[PDB]
Amino acid sequence: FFTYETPKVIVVKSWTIGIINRVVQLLIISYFVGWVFLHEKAYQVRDTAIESSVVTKVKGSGLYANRVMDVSDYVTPPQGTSVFVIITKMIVTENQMQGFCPESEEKYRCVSDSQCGPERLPGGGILTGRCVNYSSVLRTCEIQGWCPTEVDTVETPIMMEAENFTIFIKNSIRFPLFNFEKGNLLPNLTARDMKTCRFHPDKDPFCPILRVGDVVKFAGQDFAKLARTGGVLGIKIGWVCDLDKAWDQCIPKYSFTRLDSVSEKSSVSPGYNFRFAKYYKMENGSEYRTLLKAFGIRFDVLVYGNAGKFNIIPTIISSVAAFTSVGVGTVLCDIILLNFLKGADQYKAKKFEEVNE
Amino acid sequence: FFTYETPKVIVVKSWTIGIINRVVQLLIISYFVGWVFLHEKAYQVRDTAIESSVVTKVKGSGLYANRVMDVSDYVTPPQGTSVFVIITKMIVTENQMQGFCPESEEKYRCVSDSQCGPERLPGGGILTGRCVNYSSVLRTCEIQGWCPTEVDTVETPIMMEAENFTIFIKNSIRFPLFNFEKGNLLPNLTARDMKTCRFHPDKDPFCPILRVGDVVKFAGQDFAKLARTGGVLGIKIGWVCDLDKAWDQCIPKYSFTRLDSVSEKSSVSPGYNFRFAKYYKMENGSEYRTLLKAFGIRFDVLVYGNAGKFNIIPTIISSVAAFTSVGVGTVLCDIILLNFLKGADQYKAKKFEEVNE
Amino acid sequence: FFTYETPKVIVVKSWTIGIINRVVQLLIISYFVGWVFLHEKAYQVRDTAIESSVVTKVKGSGLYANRVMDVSDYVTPPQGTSVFVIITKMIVTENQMQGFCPESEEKYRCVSDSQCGPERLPGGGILTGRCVNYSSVLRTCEIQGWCPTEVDTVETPIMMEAENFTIFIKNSIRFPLFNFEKGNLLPNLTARDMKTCRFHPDKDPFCPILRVGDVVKFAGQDFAKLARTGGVLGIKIGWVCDLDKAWDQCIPKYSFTRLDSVSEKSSVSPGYNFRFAKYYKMENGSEYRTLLKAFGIRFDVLVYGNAGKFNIIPTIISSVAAFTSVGVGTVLCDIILLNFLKGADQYKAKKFEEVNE
């Protein structure tokens, strides 16, 4: 049945409620224009599924254990991904072989073979149950495994030179929704630039060479301590780009932080270290290995971003929401008009028609 | 033109439609108060961009191949990240050298040199085209590469002791929106605690030491089988925290599962294994290597979470949505009033004014 | 006070505005039925927190440096995760030892000891400050470190055979919201299938064997060049599944691309390479190593997806939004009726009641 309903309406002409209503409407409109559209950029589509690729390479040489250490000695793993370690401190145990020997840590002290049992399984290898002489002063439980066991009585030095190593970060990102590609290596970067650019998160965001010490400082850490305990530093690269502006306005934002925050607050586990071994065998069949306890700084490059570009659909939908919402003022203007205008009684009479039954 | 419109309204006074309308309104209000605000916590802002850091360390010793294996023998890779493997089974091929030799697998059986060609490229090295004697009973295609080739006729044992290794998980998380930091190592964790805490997802979520066997059990797996085939276990740590409550109420939730689910359902690929080599060279220039086929359990620690905290903006917006929505009952109350109240005719007459032209 | 308000309404009976109003309503309804419900599937819940597991294994043998290279020689790292490298080109420096020696790169050319200082820290080891003879024609700064240093005067060949290696991808995914599990290895995959299936993103998405050369081609790259410079290829596996259809309708979508896009656009850094060393020691205590500069293709398997399944809550909410929105046509029908129907004056008179004071 083709019939169109529309409500009968009172049309007050008082100047007060006119200005007040037009004012409330102007406030709604201004809120949508200023906050929903400008600040929150509701007029554009957003891409958050950013595709990122990170390739890294470290350079620098250091003196440690009276030997020169280069990238292949101190960076692990070696494949140049977004997570890698620069080893800044080591505890080395040369020429371990499978056999029997006493633990060196005082935590394994024994006077009699009775104390050597399941109560102290952690560390070294498997206990024999015997109690043996580590030195003339100390006696410890005998173990079968890699011998001799490691010793941690005196602290080893750090590789101070590591503060001066360089990290090359080649980062490529793409917002697929807009088919947009950019990286921190601009296409006009020259060999000279690589030789002389000085990275700074504000002054030069497109220099791909970062000094380790600078990264540690930006993260609010003291290299002397971090290199002693080890830790984890995050290099966050953010691509928040407004594709309505120029390609050259899309700029990476570098943040630096320490990620293993629980470590600084903990007396039981203060840094980051791990153990690995170099494996050898003699001309004879038998095997031997060097055990290494490495302390270092773990870097992981975390890439995030979102892009926005003007689109008609969201603009239409959002403006429709604006116009639909401009009406909401009628509840306020109604309270005011019907209850606080000294002419309220007349308006209440004209607006409401009571009914009974 | 400062003019304020408002609609003329009928004001029924029937008790039935009064109670029914106030009831529908109470139902809307109660739905918003109970579901939108309480259950869905629409009164608070949410942070989902959680920053997580995971450091791991394994401890334990085992007997395998009549040698003691420690962390550096059986964990790979070694850097203590959120993904690592404990090797529970091995197939070892000692002292391989570059040369010529016959394949040992029956899948390469040949009677004549004709059968040795491109049809069987997988495995070993490059075929010479010749057919040679592996043993007096079996003959196989000759290959050039690492010799001798590996053999898989009889199954090797697993490292049962691995069920007893321990995994140390130091996890640090931060919700940046609220500048909130916490980890599974509480600041009051003591050396005694580390020596004696018993991890349980409910009874002790802040014990950082997890027993491998316990992890395998929580994931509904049988260590005896998993260690034979290899597999992938996920340790999920969830931080779902209501920052309106106390910091100490923010607690990690551990889940355990097997991630390579396709493996249990497959007859062709049942677990997880990989090959690597230890490289050596003699006093002579020539090189030789030990080849290793490792079966093990891959652990990856997956950290997720979201935080919520009271904020005024979303509370205002949501309550505005509540009041705006309370009106929607008028369509129902209209159907009822106008069509099912026995006094309907009068109301239809008072409400509608027909027009023609 | 149990009172029910309802507005007094004009009820035009003109056929024109009847058809026009019913038409606008039909357009709103059709927009919701066609776009909000069908295309955008607003009638179902969505799971985006997909759980994915990837296990990889490479197979193939190649000839390089007149030796046969198998998986343990050219894949790194070895643990078969979703990111791995196939090494396609190498620069080998045999039997390095700690000592003194001259740089070989012309970039370190010196005539006098004065030029050997901090200005050229990158590369090799630590400068002694002396200027020494590399050859009768060239002189370079002496360094202390691993000797001899590497040389890059003539380009080494690539491992062409790598185009023919195979990548086994076992991918298991689970949408937890719907407790849905599936992988690219179907449970009915047979050894024959593994021996003979030919992967294609459209014709055979469930073949888990991918030929390296095919992956390089799908990513729009030339193996001859990529294997020379190195690079990063992404294998994206997308699980976009409508759980209202059959389990067997849930199919993976393979995409291939090159992720280090900045490399092709850059003259300073064109590919992907990294350095590592094989470590040895003689019967004597002293150590020596082989240094390797590896160029290769990095593959990382990126798994994404979202699942949707019918649910009552979102259907109710969305249909409620449809009916609520069907009214919005009244502003348009009002403009038309009140201003463009030649009978407008009568309607304006019936609808509006002016008031003054």
Ligand SMILES: Nc1ncnc2c1ncn2[C@@H]1O[C@H](COP(=O)(O)OP(=O)(O)OP(=O)(O)O)[C@@H](O)[C@H]1O
């Ligand atoms: N898997 C594990 N099982 C039991 N205890 C562990 C484990 N991993 C670490 N720990 C203990 O937790 C504490 C902190 O570990 P952390 O690695 O930070 O210090 P550490 O002195 O390097 O430990 P260690 O030298 O024994 O490897 C130490 O007492 C350490 O022995």
Ligand SMILES: Nc1ncnc2c1ncn2[C@@H]1O[C@H](COP(=O)(O)OP(=O)(O)OP(=O)(O)O)[C@@H](O)[C@H]1O
């Ligand atoms: N890259 C590849 N190319 C061809 N076939 C492969 C590849 N990777 C694995 N396969 C085959 O898929 C099947 C399952 O592989 P899986 O690694 O689970 O078992 P496997 O017995 O350890 O295989 P293998 O011992 O040959 O490495 C095996 O038949 C294996 O040969």
Ligand SMILES: Nc1ncnc2c1ncn2[C@@H]1O[C@H](COP(=O)(O)OP(=O)(O)OP(=O)(O)O)[C@@H](O)[C@H]1O
């Ligand atoms: N950590 C770093 N510090 C300084 N320069 C670097 C660093 N990493 C790479 N570079 C330089 O950036 C340029 C591009 O590096 P890339 O690795 O792509 O090429 P390359 O020729 O393999 O470099 P190299 O052979 O010196 O390792 C080269 O000139 C290289 O020396």
Ligand SMILES: OC[C@H]1O[C@H](O[C@H]2[C@H](O)[C@@H](O)[C@@H](O)O[C@@H]2CO)[C@H](O)[C@@H](O)[C@@H]1O
């Ligand atoms: O500037 C190039 C850009 O123009 C258009 O975008 C507008 C944008 O909407 C405005 O906010 C303004 O600040 O920037 C542009 C006007 O110069 C389109 O995005 C497109 O045509 C083009 O990329």
Ligand SMILES: OC[C@H]1O[C@H](O[C@H]2[C@H](O)[C@@H](O)[C@@H](O)O[C@@H]2CO)[C@H](O)[C@@H](O)[C@@H]1O
């Ligand atoms: O507004 C962006 C919009 O993009 C897509 O919508 C497309 C649709 O995919 C096409 O079929 C086309 O015909 O209509 C739309 C044109 O923009 C997404 O499907 C949609 O989710 C997204 O909002």
Ligand SMILES: OC[C@H]1O[C@H](O[C@H]2[C@H](O)[C@@H](O)[C@@H](O)O[C@@H]2CO)[C@H](O)[C@@H](O)[C@@H]1O
């Ligand atoms: O309790 C400390 C906390 O108080 C405030 O939060 C309220 C919260 O809104 C209530 O739901 C209640 O359950 O908890 C708190 C009242 O004790 C604020 O969040 C803030 O002042 C403070 O952190």
Ligand SMILES: OC[C@H]1O[C@H](O[C@H]2[C@H](O)[C@@H](O)[C@@H](O)O[C@@H]2CO)[C@H](O)[C@@H](O)[C@@H]1O
């Ligand atoms: O409601 C949370 C809100 O936080 C931010 O809004 C800020 C804004 O960034 C500031 O400029 C400030 O002046 O106004 C708001 C105060 O909360 C986010 O911009 C916004 O997206 C988010 O909703």
Ligand SMILES: OC[C@H]1O[C@H](O[C@H]2[C@H](O)[C@@H](O)[C@@H](O)O[C@@H]2CO)[C@H](O)[C@@H](O)[C@@H]1O
């Ligand atoms: O088909 C099995 C499936 O049926 C139901 O889903 C409907 C779906 O809503 C329709 O769009 C249609 O295309 O597919 C199904 C009708 O065959 C339920 O999802 C459930 O009972 C079952 O899984």
Ligand SMILES: OC[C@H]1O[C@H](O[C@H]2[C@H](O)[C@@H](O)[C@@H](O)O[C@@H]2CO)[C@H](O)[C@@H](O)[C@@H]1O
């Ligand atoms: O519509 C999906 C819905 O799922 C969950 O809602 C559940 C709720 O968790 C249960 O307590 C149950 O009693 O009520 C709902 C039944 O679907 C989520 O809580 C909610 O966020 C989600 O929308």
Ligand SMILES: *[C@@H]1O[C@H](CO)[C@@H](O)[C@H](O)[C@H]1NC(C)=O
């Ligand atoms: C170690 O042996 C020495 C002599 O061999 C002697 O001092 C003592 O018996 C042992 N040490 C301890 C602490 O018992």
Ligand SMILES: *[C@@H]1O[C@H](CO)[C@@H](O)[C@H](O)[C@H]1NC(C)=O
């Ligand atoms: C870092 O290098 C500069 C010269 O490039 C040198 O002056 C400084 O001492 C170095 N720092 C350390 C800790 O060696």
Ligand SMILES: *[C@@H]1O[C@H](CO)[C@@H](O)[C@H](O)[C@H]1NC(C)=O
């Ligand atoms: C390289 O191009 C970018 C892109 O606009 C520009 O900002 C930069 O100034 C250019 N570099 C030089 C040295 O001109």
Ligand SMILES: *[C@@H]1O[C@H](CO)[C@@H](O)[C@H](O)[C@H]1NC(C)=O
């Ligand atoms: C091999 O010879 C070394 C001495 O050079 C000896 O220490 C080792 O025990 C021998 N092992 C075997 C198995 O003969």
Ligand SMILES: *[C@@H]1O[C@H](CO)[C@@H](O)[C@H](O)[C@H]1NC(C)=O
């Ligand atoms: C292997 O050689 C032996 C003797 O050298 C003999 O049995 C036979 O010729 C070969 N084996 C087969 C299966 O042909």
Ligand SMILES: *[C@@H]1O[C@H](CO)[C@@H](O)[C@H](O)[C@H]1NC(C)=O
């Ligand atoms: C694990 O350790 C306990 C003692 O700590 C021992 O009783 C048990 O036999 C061990 N399990 C295995 C499989 O060795």
Ligand SMILES: *[C@@H]1O[C@H](CO)[C@@H](O)[C@H](O)[C@H]1NC(C)=O
């Ligand atoms: C450590 O602090 C947390 C934080 O409230 C608390 O729950 C726990 O009981 C404390 N531990 C001890 C041993 O008091």
